[PDB]
Amino acid sequence: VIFRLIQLVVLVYVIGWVFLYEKGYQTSSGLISSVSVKLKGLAVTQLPGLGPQVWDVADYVFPAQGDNSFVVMTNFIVTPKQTQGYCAEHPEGGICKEDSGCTPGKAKRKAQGIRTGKCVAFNDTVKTCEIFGWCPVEVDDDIPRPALLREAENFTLFIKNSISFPRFKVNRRNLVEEVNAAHMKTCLFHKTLHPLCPVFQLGYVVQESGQNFSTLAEKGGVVGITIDWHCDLDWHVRHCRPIYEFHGLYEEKNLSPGFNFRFARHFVENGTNYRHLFKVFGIRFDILVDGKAGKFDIIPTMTTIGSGIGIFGVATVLC
Amino acid sequence: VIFRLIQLVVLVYVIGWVFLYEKGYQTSSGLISSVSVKLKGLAVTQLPGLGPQVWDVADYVFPAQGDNSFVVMTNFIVTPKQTQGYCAEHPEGGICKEDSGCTPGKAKRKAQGIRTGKCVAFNDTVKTCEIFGWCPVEVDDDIPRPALLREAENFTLFIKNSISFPRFKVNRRNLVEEVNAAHMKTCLFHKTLHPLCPVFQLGYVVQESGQNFSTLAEKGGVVGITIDWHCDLDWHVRHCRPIYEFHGLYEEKNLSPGFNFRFARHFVENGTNYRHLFKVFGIRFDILVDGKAGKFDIIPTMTTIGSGIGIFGVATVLC
Amino acid sequence: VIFRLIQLVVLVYVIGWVFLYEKGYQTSSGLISSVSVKLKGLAVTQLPGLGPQVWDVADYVFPAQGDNSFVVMTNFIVTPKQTQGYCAEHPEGGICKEDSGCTPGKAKRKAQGIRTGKCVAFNDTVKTCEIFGWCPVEVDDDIPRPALLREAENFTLFIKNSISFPRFKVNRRNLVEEVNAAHMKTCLFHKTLHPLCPVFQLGYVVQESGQNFSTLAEKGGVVGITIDWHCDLDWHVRHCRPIYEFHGLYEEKNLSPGFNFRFARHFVENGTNYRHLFKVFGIRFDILVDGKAGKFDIIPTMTTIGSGIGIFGVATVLC
Ligand SMILES: *[C@@H]1O[C@H](CO)[C@@H](O)[C@H](O)[C@H]1NC(C)=O
Numbered sequence: 001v002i003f004r005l006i007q008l009v010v011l012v013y014v015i016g017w018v019f020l021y022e023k024g025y026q027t028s029s030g031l032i033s034s035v036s037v038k039l040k041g042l043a044v045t046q047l048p049g050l051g052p053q054v055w056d057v058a059d060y061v062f063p064a065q066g067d068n069s070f071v072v073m074t075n076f077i078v079t080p081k082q083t084q085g086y087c088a089e090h091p092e093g094g095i096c097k098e099d100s101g102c103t104p105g106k107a108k109r110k111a112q113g114i115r116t117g118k119c120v121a122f123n124d125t126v127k128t129c130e131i132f133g134w135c136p137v138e139v140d141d142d143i144p145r146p147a148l149l150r151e152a153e154n155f156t157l158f159i160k161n162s163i164s165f166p167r168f169k170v171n172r173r174n175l176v177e178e179v180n181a182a183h184m185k186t187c188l189f190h191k192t193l194h195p196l197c198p199v200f201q202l203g204y205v206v207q208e209s210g211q212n213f214s215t216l217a218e219k220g221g222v223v224g225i226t227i228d229w230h231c232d233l234d235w236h237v238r239h240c241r242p243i244y245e246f247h248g249l250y251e252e253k254n255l256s257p258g259f260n261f262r263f264a265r266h267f268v269e270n271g272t273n274y275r276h277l278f279k280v281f282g283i284r285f286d287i288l289v290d291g292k293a294g295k296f297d298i299i300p301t302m303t304t305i306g307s308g309i310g311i312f313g314v315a316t317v318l319c
Numbered sequence: 320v321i322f323r324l325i326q327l328v329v330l331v332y333v334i335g336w337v338f339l340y341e342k343g344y345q346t347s348s349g350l351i352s353s354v355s356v357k358l359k360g361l362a363v364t365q366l367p368g369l370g371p372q373v374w375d376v377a378d379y380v381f382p383a384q385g386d387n388s389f390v391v392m393t394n395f396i397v398t399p400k401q402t403q404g405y406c407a408e409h410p411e412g413g414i415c416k417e418d419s420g421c422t423p424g425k426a427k428r429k430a431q432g433i434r435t436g437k438c439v440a441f442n443d444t445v446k447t448c449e450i451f452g453w454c455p456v457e458v459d460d461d462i463p464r465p466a467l468l469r470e471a472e473n474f475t476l477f478i479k480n481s482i483s484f485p486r487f488k489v490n491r492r493n494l495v496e497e498v499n500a501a502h503m504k505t506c507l508f509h510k511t512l513h514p515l516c517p518v519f520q521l522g523y524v525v526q527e528s529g530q531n532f533s534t535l536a537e538k539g540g541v542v543g544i545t546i547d548w549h550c551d552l553d554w555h556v557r558h559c560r561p562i563y564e565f566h567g568l569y570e571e572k573n574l575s576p577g578f579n580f581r582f583a584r585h586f587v588e589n590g591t592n593y594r595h596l597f598k599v600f601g602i603r604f605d606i607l608v609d610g611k612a613g614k615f616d617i618i619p620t621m622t623t624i625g626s627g628i629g630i631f632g633v634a635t636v637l638c
Numbered sequence: 639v640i641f642r643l644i645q646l647v648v649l650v651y652v653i654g655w656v657f658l659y660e661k662g663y664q665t666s667s668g669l670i671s672s673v674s675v676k677l678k679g680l681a682v683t684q685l686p687g688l689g690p691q692v693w694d695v696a697d698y699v700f701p702a703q704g705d706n707s708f709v710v711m712t713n714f715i716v717t718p719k720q721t722q723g724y725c726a727e728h729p730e731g732g733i734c735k736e737d738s739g740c741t742p743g744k745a746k747r748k749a750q751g752i753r754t755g756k757c758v759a760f761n762d763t764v765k766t767c768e769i770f771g772w773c774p775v776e777v778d779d780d781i782p783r784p785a786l787l788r789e790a791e792n793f794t795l796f797i798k799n800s801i802s803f804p805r806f807k808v809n810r811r812n813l814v815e816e817v818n819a820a821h822m823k824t825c826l827f828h829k830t831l832h833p834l835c836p837v838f839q840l841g842y843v844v845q846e847s848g849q850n851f852s853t854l855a856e857k858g859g860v861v862g863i864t865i866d867w868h869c870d871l872d873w874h875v876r877h878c879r880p881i882y883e884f885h886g887l888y889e890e891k892n893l894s895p896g897f898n899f900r901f902a903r904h905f906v907e908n909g910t911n912y913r914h915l916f917k918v919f920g921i922r923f924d925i926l927v928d929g930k931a932g933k934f935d936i937i938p939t940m941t942t943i944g945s946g947i948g949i950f951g952v953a954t955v956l957c
Pocket residue numbers: 091092123124126141
């Protein structure tokens with residue numbers, strides 16, 4: 001009865017593995033998603049000399065209107081009131097002992113301005129070639145050991161995610177609407193305790209991504225909040241819930257270069273254009289929503305059955 | 320002749336259903352899309368006291384450069400010239416009858432600043448704990464019954480969408496280039512009259528999404544403009560046109576919380592940093608482009624035929 | 639031996655074409671990607687009268703924090719210190735010889751403000767209807783023949799792209815980490831010389847997209863940098879590298895309208911709100927990352943084999 005043994009193996013594969021395990025009787029379908037991230041949290045910096053400085057959702061969220069891939073500022077370097085005048089160059093670009101060593105015109109590489117050919121003093125001692133550009137130039141030589149926005153670990157990230165599968169015309173929201181009047185705005189996400197709460201503490205998000213928040217709070221980083229949908233639409237639609245997973249992107253063996261984009265707050269004072277050059281060492285959260293809806297379709301079901309007869313056929317022939 | 324009857328059912332399924340109906344002889348392929356949204360429209364607000372205030376594409380579009388998921392401001396609450404000084408707190412955060420009820424330091428939850436421990440008067444009567452923060456604090460207690468930007472319903476949304484299917488190396492534009500010199504910039508999209516015109520009135524977009532514009536114009540909302548491509552590349556490439564569909568995202572039983580992001584216009588006056596805190600109740604339009612190109616490929620065609628022989632086989636065996 | 643000849647053709651198709659050529663023994667899977675674009679480059683404009691004007695990564699990148707679809711400003715038209723007062727209208731909107739020809743209220747189409755009904759002089763000769771709006775109005779009548787930011791062709795676009803295939807739990811970075819201490823920051827991308835260097839010169843990107851940079855530098859354009867991943871995860875993960883391809887989106891027979899979005903730099907002077915209306919003729923780079931990981935899966939392998947037996951079956955029956 002070797003045929004029966006061979007046929008049983010084929011029958012197990014078609015039913016147990018393809019259908020029961022691999023869900024081969026359903027047509028997988030992707031989703032188009034819309035993510036609305038809402039942040040709550042205020043961070044004070046206690047900056048010496050200047051004093052405390054608060055930062056609300058309008059100031060530490062890039063873009064302000066929110067996006068799938070947004071940035072939460074955790075640290076920054078500010079150059080107050082930059083103007084396009086004549087000043088020294090940063091030593092990293094170049095140094096000079098006399099005006100004869102300063103080549104007129106913009107530098108070939110690492111250019112910070114129009115080198116006028118004059119050697120002026122960036123430091124009390126170090127003298128760098130005068131350049132036409134944003135003055136004073138961005139020093140960017142020290143990163144505050146305690147992150148200026150260190151409180152951002154307590155910031156709550158409310159993610160309002162709406163997905164839809166065009167093939168099956170099924171629309172789902174990351175809010176399962178099981179909340180009650182008292183439970184309203186009284187949950188924080190946890191991988192075990194509250195897997196369905198869409199409110200994420202940033203410190204918890206970074207921690208569950210394998211990255212220490214204090215390391216990312218200073219130099220910046222990128223965290224991928226993958227909202228994974230695995231709707232088995234053969235069942236009821238309420239049984240499909242998002243599975244939030246956090247990944248440390250650009251880890252580089254858990255030593256990331258740190259997300260350190262630069263943005264300016266342009267303003268005009270006394271009729272002269274100025275700007276506030278912020279080198280923001282923020283944590284960029286990317287809501288990489290992925291989905292695979294498995295709904296019973298007669299095409300994969302019957303092709304597998306036909307495949308099975310082919311699988312069963314070839315097998316018994318060989319034996 | 321029961322075999323012929325069973326075989327006919329299988330033959331109908333393979334040809335009529337899989338091939339003719341389900342297009343099982345073609346390899347479905349997704350697309351990578353690029354969306355360039357152009358808006359035309361000016362909205363006046365006729366704000367009492369201040370007077371009229373115009374809002375052009377530079378001011379009511381977030382982001383300004385445009386994106387797949389952008390926001391069109393339909394209403395806003397403005398806090399003019401916020402400064403990081405010492406003032407009262409919003410009553411929602413907390414209230415106080417005396418300085419002894421104000422806990423020094425930042426509040427555990429619903430924190431709006433650094434509570435100095437002093438109880439000062441937010442209202443003529445209500446007294447809230449003094450907090451270091453953006454002053455004056457955002458009241459956010461009244462929403463203009465007529466939306467400040469109510470004219471946005473007449474705003475035209477010109478969507479320049481370029482898609483491409485990497486598998487088939489076919490590039491398509493939502494502009495079928497059937498326009499003529501006179502027809503240029505003389506069409507508005509309609510689900511029946513002009514299904515191919517890429518210029519969408521925002522009032523029409525919201526209306527066709529099942530949401531009343533006046534409701535969304537005040538508190539904000541999210542509208543999903545799904546540009547659906549269903550190219551049957553077996554035919555000519557000109558026969559593939561976008562199918563624009565509008566969906567009300569986060570409807571919550573047609574009672575949305577309203578998209579109400581906050582952004583600031585930072586500026587410096589008299590050497591002091593200020594900002595204009597706008598709580599924008601805009602309508603966020605997400606251009607969720609989805610595509611499935613069906614081009615004749617020998618792999619799905621012959622696997623179905625092989626599946627068919629398996630389907631036909633198993634059937635006649637059972638009978 | 640016609641059967642053997644027919645069987646050989648089927649056997650070649652199943653193995654040679656489906657498996658060896660079309661990789662029909664592997665389950666294709668898409669990827670969720672995160673793109674971090676870093677730009678280096680300073681552009682001077684040598685604007686007559688005003689003088690030189692520098693533009694760094696903080697000023698010519700939209701959005702500042704970076705995104706998959708970002709804009710690099712190559713040209714702009716600036717309207718300094720626009721205010722919401724009473725001034726003339728642009729002639730394109732309308733003209734007038736007397737106040738009786740100016741209809742009070744906002745214009746039905748091409749409206750630039752609240753027409754007060756008075757006919758004032760936009761030009762020394764041309765007289766247009768006074769409108770309440772941003773004053774002075776955007777002329778937008780001349781485009782600098784040499785692009786103000788023409789140096790942007792030398793700008794280096796460092797693209798830090800992290801992808802991941804959720805089905806196979808494989809994370810990849812566009813950085814293959816073959817760099818050495820000396821090679822660090824010493825490469826530029828080339829289609830042949832350096833196919834793996836993630837640093838792209840913008841002039842090279844536009845040139846390889848089939849578009850002349852000088853044409854796009856003036857009126858703007860859209861360039862699609864498709865980072866294509868084709869991981870054959872059956873092999874080692876190091877053998878999968880990104881394939882960068884540049885496409886000219888919205889070419890319109892290689893005559894693009896030019897990406898010409900508008901953004902404003904709002905500021906307050908003397909207690910009055912102003913803005914700097916920039917019509918940016920930038921080049922919008924869209925990082926359209928696409929991926930198809932082929933990893934050996936028993937489902938496509940055995941269904942093809944079963945399909946084959948069906949293919950082989952039907953064939954020999956016909957003959
Ligand atoms: C001299 O310039 C360098 C720039 O790298 C800076 O780090 C250093 O602090 C300066 N020295 C002093 C005494 O300020």
